[PDB]
């Protein structure tokens, strides 16, 4: 079933999340000053 | 045990198998004694015995006995030749049948294939009769173990063949066509290795699993193998025709098969050795598992090789395509 | 008991048919192993058994059977490595049409050995009943082995109740002209005519062409008709073997036999019984024949396991009080014997958990020697000695599959100890005592494509025929002389209607010809002075009687009547006169070799041939069992019957090897 792959996309969520915390936080030329945003949910509001 | 073999064979050879000058100076046989002629052009022994040639699908009983005389022509008369063929064939039949009846059938031997059993031992009826007379060893002391080793290898061959429930045509065409098999080696008779055994396995497997008659398979193998090797290489045409025939035999895409040969680099495309068909068939098994494009199924080998990503992501997507399409075929 | 945990099981597929045999078999004196006594059974997608095996062939990887079938899936043409490929073929209406067997082992097997028989029928308006059948020699001539001539419906046929009926079964061995029948449907007479010379071994008994206007050349002068009268109960009022033997019987208020009186040829008719007592089970209890002895029998009334039998001449008998025997017997829970004894010293037995016999120690008569294909001399007179039947041990051994191994023995009273060992096929039931051949794979060459043996006891002459029947033989002879040979006629029911043997070269030329008929054996040992004599079915199981037409005895009367002890095995082990003295006592192993053989007088040897198992001896020692035949030195059938498939794999499987496991010997 597609359910089988339906995990992958959560993995992709995690990937994005780390790309935020790992790359964006130190590499955000945007938002370079502002921090907080510790949790995934945050940008779902702030820019998503 | 061995003495009882030599018992019948040593006496019966002298009794009936000894073909004679009068047998070749019969009422119709005018002029020069064919017995002498064949006792010159070696076909009949000085003991009158037939010089038994090994059977092969390249010819047949009377075709061989005809060519035997026609290749030189001590008589030009078709009548004399043909009836002499009748004479030498009755002689050879008696010779061979007697040897079959004499060999310990208790060996678990089907008498009907004794001469081909001999040919798998490489040996022939005539050389058997030669050794038979070389000692007439109807006694335990004169039986040299070289002779009994044949029966021993027959114990092997028979337990095998008895598990096979062999057809004489199989062994006949086998020894005729090792070039159709995966191997063509000098003393397979003794080497008896795993490749040969697996060839037997996959051969019989294909036989039982195929959609069509065995001779239709032999026809495929003629039309593919002999046809490709008529000249050095000779068979562009029968790529598709063999692929479709095999598709009739096995129910799978001829086109897919042709492409399989293409990626195998087999030119001409006709997979025509038992191992080649078996590989192809394994590909079909993989198809029966997952119905994926065999191109990619084969491309999958590179995945293990890393060192690059584009092929990897491509085939990855291919696996997803398989997942969706085949899963859907499994679920819709 | 160690017999525990030997159970039988059955195990099924999801169709619900038992995919294997299971037992749990232990040899008791080596109790650590219980055998792999289990075997393969295989059934098609129609649920019909395609295969089953001897386990001993399974790792040998060679198959044992074939079956072939129609729509409706009935078996047609079918083989086993012992039975050979075989056919009987039948109408839509199941009427038989043709029969064939004896086909070789290459697969291109030779039906020129088909041994054919085929069947022929009425036409419209008549319903299609079989008027005839013919042999066909495989690949060759057909000859009309019988007709079944159906009557019309004349007032005559009404009178005779033969309306539409077979008034003339023209047949092998001649004709039975069925020529009167009762309103009770019972026959009332039938002219059994033999052949024009029934001792002619080669006149056809085949009934070609228009009608008996031809076959008058072939039917007998021996118009040895039978005639009959009947109760409304259908029990026999009287019946008369028209050569002159006749019978009458009477019964109790319910229907048990109370008396019978049986005319020997043209004589008076006399009662067989002096005193009678049954059990309430209708089994015997306390009887006195014309013999005038008290005999009595004692049993477990719950089961009629006879615990014993006693005989005496009673006090006040014509020859006074004299005990003649007092046998006692012992049995297991399922009811296998374990020992017997008698007085006027004991014997005892052992079996596999399978109840396959393994031991039979007892006492057996000195001087009889080690068993051959012979009958010894009797001890004469009957020993009063306490000992000449010296104690001994004997034992049995058997294959994993349904085949014997060996009999093994000691005679410690004389050190006459020995063992018998059987050579047997790598691949079939074909097998014999190892001195015929020691080779267990040569041995299989010795048997026909129908698995009958190619040659006799030690290679002597034999021919098998249609109806499968052995029909000529050379039991033993000097220099291959035919003057010691033997041959038979039988009817289509295989009724062994006539013996014709020679034993006369430089010998008494009394040609050993004997007829057999309803009520009758007629030994006709003709030409020394012809010894021609009848003996009658005084019963069947039988009292027995004799009448010389010629070749009179010495010191002995014509028409003398004698009773006999067909025992718990019907074995006629003792014979007694009308005066309560024993003529002869004899006994035999389960293997059928004699334990004892004795008589009070010597030429009494000539007068007794029905013996152990209650069956007829053939001349050498082997028994005419009754359709098949039994060899005692081998302790086996000398005869295959693959129709035993209903009850076992081995074509020569004798019996459940404790023979007393089973009740009644027809000897097929």
Shape of chain C: globular
Overall SS class of chain A: mainly alpha
The multimeric state of the shown protein is: part of a larger assembly
Total DSSP E strands of chain A:
0
* Beta-strand content estimate of chain C: 35-45%
Integer-rounded radius of gyration of chain A = 13 Å
Radius of gyration of chain C: 27 Å
In angstroms, what separates the terminal alpha carbons of chain A?
Answer: 30 Å
**What is the helix fraction of residues of chain A, given as a range?**
40-55%
Query: Can you write the helix and strand succession of chain A as a string?
Result: HH
Sheet having the most strands of chain C: 12 strands, antiparallel
Q: For the largest beta sheet of chain C, what order do the strands appear in spatially?
A: 21-22-23-24-25-26-27-28-29-30-31-32
- The biggest beta sheet of chain A, please? none
Distance between the termini of chain C: 37 Å
In helices, the fraction of residues of chain C equals under 10%
PDB class: toxin
Keywords: Toxin, pore-forming, insecticidal, chitinases
Entry title: Yersinia entomophaga holotoxin complex in pore conformation
Chain A: Toxin subunit YenA2
Provide keyphrases for this structure.
part of a larger assembly, 3 chains, A: 48 residues, mainly alpha, 2 helices, elongated, B: 332 residues, 62% helix
Q: How would you sum up this structure, described in words?
A:
The PDB classes it as toxin. The entry lists the keywords Toxin, pore-forming, chitinases. With 48 residues, chain A is mainly alpha-helical. Chain A is elongated and about 45 Å long. Chain A has helices at residues 8-27, 41-46. Chain B has 332 residues and is mostly helical. Chain B has 16 helices and no strands. Chain B has helices at residues 2-17, 34-38, 61-70, 78-102, 114-120, 125-135, 145-164, 168-176, 188-191, 194-209, 214-228, 238-250, 254-264, 274-290, 294-299, 310-329. The longest helix of chain B is centred in the first third of the chain and has 25 residues, at 78-102. Helix content of chain C is 2%, strand content 38%. Chain C has a twelve-stranded antiparallel sheet, with no helix packed on it. In chain C, strands 12, 13, 14, 15, 16, 17, 18, 19 and 20 form a nine-stranded antiparallel sheet that branches. In chain C, strand 44 and strand 45 form a beta hairpin. The interface between B and C is small, with 10 and 6 residues.
């Amino acid at each position: 079933s597609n359910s089988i792959e339906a995990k992958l996309q959560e993995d992709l969520r995690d990937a994005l999340v780390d790309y935020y915390l790992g790359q964006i936080v130190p590499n955000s030329k945007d938002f370079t000053n502002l921090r907080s945003t510790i949790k995934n949910v945050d940008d779902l509001y702030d820019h998503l | 045990n061995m003495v009882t073999f030599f018992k019948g064979i040593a006496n019966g050879l002298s009794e009936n198998v000894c073909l004679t000058t009068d047998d070749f100076q019969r009422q119709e046989l005018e002029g020069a004694d064919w017995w002498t002629l064949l006792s010159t052009n070696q076909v009949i022994d000085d003991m009158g015995l037939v010089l038994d040639i090994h059977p092969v699908w390249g010819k047949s009983d009377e075709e061989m006995l005809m060519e035997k005389i026609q290749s030189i022509g001590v008589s030009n008369d078709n009548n004399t030749l043909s009836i002499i063929v009748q004479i030498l064939i009755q002689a050879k039949n008696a010779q061979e049948n007697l040897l079959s009846q004499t060999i310990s059938a208790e060996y678990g031997v089907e008498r009907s294939v004794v001469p081909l059993q001999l040919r798998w031992l490489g040996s022939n009826v005539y050389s058997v009769l030669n050794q038979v007379l070389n000692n007439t060893p109807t006694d335990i002391s004169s039986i040299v173990p070289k002779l009994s080793e044949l029966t021993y290898s027959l114990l092997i061959y028979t337990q095998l063949i008895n598990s096979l429930k062999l057809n004489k045509e199989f062994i006949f065409l086998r020894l005729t066509q090792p070039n159709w098999l995966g191997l063509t080696q000098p003393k397979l008779s003794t080497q008896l290795s795993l490749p040969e055994i697996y060839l037997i396995t996959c051969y019989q497997d294909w036989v039982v699993n195929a959609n069509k008659n065995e001779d239709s398979i032999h026809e495929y193998l003629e039309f593919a193998n002999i046809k490709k090797t008529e000249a050095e290489k000779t068979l562009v045409d029968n790529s598709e025709k063999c692929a479709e025939l095999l598709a009739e035999i096995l129910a799978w895409d001829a086109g897919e098969i042709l492409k399989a040969a293409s990626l195998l680099g087999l030119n001409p495309p006709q997979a025509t050795n038992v191992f080649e068909i078996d590989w192809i068939r394994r590909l079909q098994t993989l198809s029966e598992k997952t119905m994926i494009s065999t191109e990619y199924l084969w491309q999958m080998g590179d995945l293990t090789e890393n060192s690059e990503f584009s092929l990897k992501e491509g085939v990855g997507e291919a696996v997803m395509a398989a997942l969706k399409a085949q899963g859907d075929s499994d679920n819709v | 008991q160690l017999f525990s945990k030997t159970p039988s099981v059955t195990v099924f597929d999801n169709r619900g048919l038992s995919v294997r045999d299971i037992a749990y078999r232990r040899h008791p004196d080596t109790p650590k192993v219980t055998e792999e006594c289990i075997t393969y059974h295989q059934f098609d997608f129609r649920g019909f058994l395609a295969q089953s095996l001897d386990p001993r062939l399974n790792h040998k990887e060679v198959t044992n059977f074939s079956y072939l079938t129609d729509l409706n899936g009935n078996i047609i043409y079918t083989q086993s490595v012992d039975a050979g490929n075989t056919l009987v073929l039948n109408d839509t209406e199941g009427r038989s049409v043709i029969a064939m067997t004896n086909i070789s082992r290459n697969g291109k097997d030779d039906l020129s050995l088909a041994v054919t028989r085929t069947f022929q029928y009425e036409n419209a308006p008549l319903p299609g009943r079989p008027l005839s059948v013919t042999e066909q020699v495989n690949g060759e001539n057909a000859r009309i082995t019988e007709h079944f001539v159906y009557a019309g419906n004349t007032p005559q046929e009404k009178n005779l109740n033969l309306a539409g009926q077979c008034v003339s079964y023209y047949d092998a061995a001649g004709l039975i002209q069925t020529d009167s029948v009762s309103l009770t449907g019972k026959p009332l007479s039938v002219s059994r005519k033999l052949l024009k010379n029934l001792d002619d071994t080669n006149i056809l008994a085949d009934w070609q062409g228009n009608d008996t206007s031809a076959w008058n050349s072939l039917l007998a002068t021996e118009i040895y008709t039978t005639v009959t009268r009947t109760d409304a109960a259908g029990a026999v009022l009287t019946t008369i073997d028209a050569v002159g033997n006749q019978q009458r019987v009477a019964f109790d208020i319910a229907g048990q036999l109370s008396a019978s009186w049986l005319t020997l040829k043209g004589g008076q008719e006399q009662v067989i019984i002096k005193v009678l007592t049954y059990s309430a089970a209708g089994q015997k209890l306390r009887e006195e024949g014309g013999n005038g002895v008290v005999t009595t029998y004692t049993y477990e009334a719950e089961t009629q396991r006879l615990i014993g039998i006693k005989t005496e001449r009673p006090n006040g008998h014509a020859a006074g009080a004299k005990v003649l025997q007092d046998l006692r017997y012992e049995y297991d829970p399922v009811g296998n014997v374990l020992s017997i004894t008698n007085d006027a010293p004991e014997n005892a037995y052992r079996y596999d958990s399978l109840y396959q016999l393994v031991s039979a120690s007892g006492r057996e008569v000195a001087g009889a020697g080690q068993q051959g294909s012979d009958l010894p001399s009797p001890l004469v007179p009957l020993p009063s000695d306490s000992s000449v039947y010296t104690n001994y041990t004997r034992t049995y051994t058997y294959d994993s599959a349904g085949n014997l191994m060996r009999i093994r023995h000691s005679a410690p009273a004389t050190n006459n100890n020995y063992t018998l060992n059987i050579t047997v096929s790598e691949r079939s039931n074909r097998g014999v005592m190892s001195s015929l051949t020691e080779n267990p794979a040569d041995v299989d060459a010795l048997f026909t494509a129908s698995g009958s043996q190619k040659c006799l006891q030690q290679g002597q002459s034999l021919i098998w025929t249609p109806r499968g029947e052995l029909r000529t033989v050379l039991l033993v002879a000097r220099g291959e002389t035919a003057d010691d040979s033997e041959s038979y006629r039988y009817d289509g029911s295989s009724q062994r209607i006539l013996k014709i043997s020679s034993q006369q070269t430089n010998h008494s030329a009394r040609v050993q010809r004997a007829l057999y008929l309803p009520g009758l054996e007629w030994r006709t040992m003709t030409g020394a002075e012809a010894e021609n004599l009848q003996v009658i079915c005084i019963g069947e199981a039988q009292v027995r009687v004799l009448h010389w037409e010629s070749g009179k005895p010495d010191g002995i009367i014509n028409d003398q009547i004698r009773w006999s002890y067909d025992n718990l095995t019907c074995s006629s082990g003792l014979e007694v006169d009308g005066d309560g003295l024993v003529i002869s006592m004899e006994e035999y192993y389960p293997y059928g070799g004699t334990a004892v053989w004795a008589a009070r007088s010597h030429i009494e040897t000539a007068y007794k041939t029905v013996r152990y198992s209650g069956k007829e001896r053939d001349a050498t020692g082997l028994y005419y069992y009754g359709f098949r035949y039994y060899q005692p030195w081998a302790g086996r059938w000398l005869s295959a019957d693959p129709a035993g498939t209903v009850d076992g794999l081995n074509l020569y499987r004798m019996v459940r090897n404790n023979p007393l496991r089973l009740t009644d010997p027809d000897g097929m």
